[PDB]
Amino acid sequence: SLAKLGEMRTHVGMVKRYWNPKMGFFIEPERKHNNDHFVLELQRQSLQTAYNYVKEVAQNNGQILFVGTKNDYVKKLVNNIAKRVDVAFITQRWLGGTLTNFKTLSISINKLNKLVEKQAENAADLTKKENLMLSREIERLEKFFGGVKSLKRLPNLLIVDDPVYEKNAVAEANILRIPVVALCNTNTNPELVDFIIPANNHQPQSTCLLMNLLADAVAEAKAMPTMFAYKPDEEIQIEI
């Protein structure tokens, strides 16, 4: 199934008393640990909303963007998924003022494209130092926009791993009326986020399961081969 109750083994967990109070309506009272739990039913409906809206945007042929910069776990997952399917991404920290203006981004990415295609044209004609620094600049441009080269226009849809951790990204997103979906952990502002998926990020198992489900949701809509469609079974991936 999808978002099965019995399929999941570790969905609770959070540092207590660091949460925004109005996020308590989507959480049931704690039993012993006071580590913020989550009502799995509303999680299921939120994931269903995400699933149907990603199908809808797939019919619209909209551009998808993945945003995540946590230490290693979701970073590795997003890198693997991004090299698996066509989607914009970023591994370095979110550049201040990226979404708010794309004209400078457009000319910079055009510069990146012309330089990389000139490297492709070049056959090591340039001397060791010239192409050495040119390749260093190419690698720097890969560090900067090596994940957002797959689009020329505004991002038609974007996921946020954590708006608190990505305050700049969600702040830029609030400026524009483009649809934005995020993962409210326990301490976010619902008015900034458009579609809400109150899942957990304090544990890596929850993050991997949810990202796998959403990646399958956004992949199977495009009729590309997928990994999980309606299978209750899942792959266990414990953090190193």
Partner: peptide, 5 residues
Amino acid sequence: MGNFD
């Protein structure tokens, strides 16, 4: 929201 189809 949800008016994008």
